[PDB]
Structures are given as C-alpha cells and as structure tokens.
Enzyme design. Sequence first.
Site: not given
Length: 330
Positions: A35, A199
């Site tokens: 994770d 992004s």
Amino acid sequence: STGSATTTPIDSLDDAYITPVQIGTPAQTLNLDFDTGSSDLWVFSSETTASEVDGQTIYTPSKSTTAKLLSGATWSISYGDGSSSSGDVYTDTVSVGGLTVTGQAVESAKKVSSSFTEDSTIDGLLGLAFSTLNTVSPTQQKTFFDNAKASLDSPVFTADLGYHAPGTYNFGFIDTTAYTGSITYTAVSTKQGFWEWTSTGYAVGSGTFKSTSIDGIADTGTTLLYLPATVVSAYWAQVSGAKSSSSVGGYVFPCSATLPSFTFGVGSARIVIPGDYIDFGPISTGSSSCFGGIQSSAGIGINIFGDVALKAAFVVFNGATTPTLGFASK
C-alpha cells in the site's frame, strides 16, 4: 541488493493485489497488500481476537527465533475507507522477493475491523508511503522500503500491476524490459506523507486533452481512480445511461455499455486507461447496473490515483533524497 516479487489480484475485479512476504525464522509466509498510501506493516497474528480471524494466515511471533517484542510500542490505524486495526509491535526479519530487512517493525494486530475479517485473502498490509505516516507510538517506525533503501542498488521500487493478471513489485532496480517507450518523471511532495504529484490534465476517449493541474496521490492500496467532480462528470457524460447514485455510493452505468478510455497527463506524456479497466461489474450479483472505476474525490479531500490508473502504467517510486515518481506505458 534487489528484490522482485509477483503480486496477484485477490479476485476477478482486481479489487486489491497480494504479494507473498516472508516474516521470521523459520519463515512464515503471509500474503500482504502493498500500500503506497500508508506506512505501517501490520499482520493478522496469534494475538488477533479469535472472532476477528476468518481464514487469514497469521504471524505467530513466539514461533520465530528472531522475533523480539518492541517493548511499550502500540499502533492504531484508520484507512480512508473507514476500516481500521490496532495492536502491539515486534521486530523481526522480513523478506520480499529475496530482499531481506532485519529488525523490521512488524505490527501485530490485536483488533481488526470487519472489512479485514471478511476478506480471507489479505493477511495484512505492507505500507510504502513515507515513514512520517507510521502510526507506531511512542517511537515511530520505518517502512520496509526505508529500512532496505541503503542496501538497495538504487533507492527505488516499482509497481507493475496487472489487469486481471499478476504483476510485479521490484525493489532496487528498474526493469527496462517491463515498459515501452520512456519513463516520464514528475515531482513529488512529501508534505502529507504520500507519493503526491500533479497530473497535467486528462482526456475522455478520443476527445481533446484538457490541460489542468490535478494534485493527487499514487496509491496502490486504493482500488479506484478518484478525481474532481468536474472531471468525473465529463467522463461519465460519455456513457449513455450512466448516473451518480447516492444509494449505491457513486457512478453506475448500464452493464451493456462500452466504456471510453481515460487519459491522464504526466508532464508532456500521456497514460491511457482502457475503458475495460473502468468496469467494476454488477453492483450486486445478477444486476444490470455496473459500478464505475472512476469516482468523485469530492468527499475525500484528496485525489487518488488508485489501481485503476496505476495498472495502466509501469510506475517508479524514486526514494532518492528528493523523491520523484516515474510513469511509462507498457
């Protein structure tokens, strides 16, 4: 040193991936959920409340000649999905794919919440976010990657998650045969303890690319892609009959639909998520309403590039003094 381990989807929807991990001496192999959105290595154990164990493999520190109680140390964690676990801590030898760390903090669960009990395929979590998020008290502990870093050939790990198939976690090297084209690297902020990046925009299907900064985290421990409501609405508007359902808890769409791809920007590069990666199947067995793999982050407080996004790429987690993330197509 290096390590290399295969990671395998737990079910037919790629809800999560499990990777075998050797703990203790002789080895006890547990299948852990790696994770990158958390920083605790915790396991089901001989100390877990018996009624809260249902098919998991447990770590028994008393059977490990290298286990040592970390005296006074406790841990308690709550995840974004509302699940939680807590317990005490041992140090022991932990190996992943041939890479061995001695003195790793292994957090032994005394209690786990129902979602963990109900999933017999996941024996614990191995956190790969920054160690500043580790919950051990009163002395915070280092992640497996942090402990291994100095020994690694290069201070990196890579995630290559499969679509409906196994993939690979590598430590200490970048397998140049595992991706196409070039890797585009992008800056990381560690201020929240996550692999947080920005992004450069998105496209829906064959539509034009929209240049816009989207701050979010690379999180292998989250199934879906969670993005701002504007972006998610633009995506689902291209699927006839799709709608957000408050009763189901997100966007659903007719199972008869063909989904468009979703593209996200990494610098000037582009990662394309095929439409079929966005289909999470019937909301309940036999239903013709299917659950979408792109969902709004509006109620989370952070955008999350979960497995839906990451499995479309070869992803480099560069843990150099100034960390960065790399994405390549594959």
